[model samples]
Target: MRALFYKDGKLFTDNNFLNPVSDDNPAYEVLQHVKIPTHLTDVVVYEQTWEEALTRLIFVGSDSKGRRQYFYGKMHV
Candidate 1:
């Protein structure tokens, strides 16, 4: 089945923790404002190439003052 996949979204908030949004409690939702409907006619399935489904992530370095900072990045399969 065709699928839309990606790395989980992670964000450090000012609260000194990870994302503060909740997955439930209508008042608090972190995902897209809209919901994913479950109705599809043309179901196309394909296997992505090794390179197409691969990713490279990195945390660069920190500042002179000793703060966490992103250094560089690249993609690999």
Candidate 2:
């Protein structure tokens, strides 16, 4: 499993939020010509067909830990 975060104009991934270890410093990717702040709440709160929306994630590139990371958010164009 992996934890996700958006910061410093990049995506971060790690096992624990209290101690993040991965970050896509180089800017991995985007959606709808915008950033995917598309956090987990997209489903929990919006009930916004999360299955279709949530799965569509951005491969924000690998982080310093040498692991590929991803983030999900309100991808509303």
Candidate 3:
């Protein structure tokens, strides 16, 4: 599937839309499945336009990697 990663230099993959989680679309369910910190919030799908583009972008947040925790916008992919 399409995804946005910070690899190399915050380069976006050619597969996904652009700002996938801007809307609460079901395509974002996979993202919602992951958990994050109470202080940080996930990208919310506020506008219909976002919903339409939910498949385009990656939602920056936090994810678990082994015993170490990794937050979005932390490192390059």
Candidate 4:
């Protein structure tokens, strides 16, 4: 287990997505089981038209590491 003992000489991992780096994913530890998002809210879609060779994106939720979590999607109509 790689631990840094945060700058204050404390392991912030103690809090689970609650405070501090409580942001970190304990979710990683149990990724073996699939999990779906909760408190589902304002899922905005930025999708692909495939008319050009560029990428399209969407905002679904948050992940501690990514600041804000996003995904890529495509559209047909």
Q: Point out where model 1 deviates above 4 Å.
A: 1-54, 72-77
- Candidate 2 backbone collisions, by pair: 37-73, 38-72, 38-73, 38-74, 39-72, 39-73
Report the C-alpha lDDT of model 3 over 1-77, residue by residue, as the tens digit.
33343222222333233432334434344334334344432222212232343344334434343232333322324
Candidate 2 residue 70 C-alpha distance from true site, Å: 0.9
The CA root-mean-square deviation of candidate 4, after full C-alpha superposition on the true structure, stands at 15.0
Q: How far is candidate 1 from the true structure (C-alpha RMSD, Å)?
A: 16.9
Q: Estimate each model's TM-score.
A: 0.19, 0.25, 0.23, 0.23
Instruction: Indicate the residue-level lDDT of 28 in model 4.
Output: 26
- Give the candidate number with the greatest TM-score: 2
Displacement of residue 50 (Cα, Å) in model 3 is: 17
Model 4: per-residue lDDT, tens digit, 1-77? 22211222122333232233333334222222223244433322222122321233322444544444544424412
Count clashing pairs, candidate 4.
0
Ranking by lDDT: 2, 3, 4, 1
Tell me the deviation in Å of residue 48 in model 1. 20
**lDDT of predicted model 4:** 0.30
Worst 10 residues of 2 by lDDT: 40-49
Name the runs in model 4 displaced over 4 angstroms. Answer: 1-39, 47-54, 62-67, 73-77
Model 1 residue pairs with clashes:
60-71
Which is the winner by lDDT between candidate 1 and candidate 2? 2
lDDT by residue for model 2 (1-77), tens: 23244444433353223443333322233322344333322111111233434444433445555554554545523
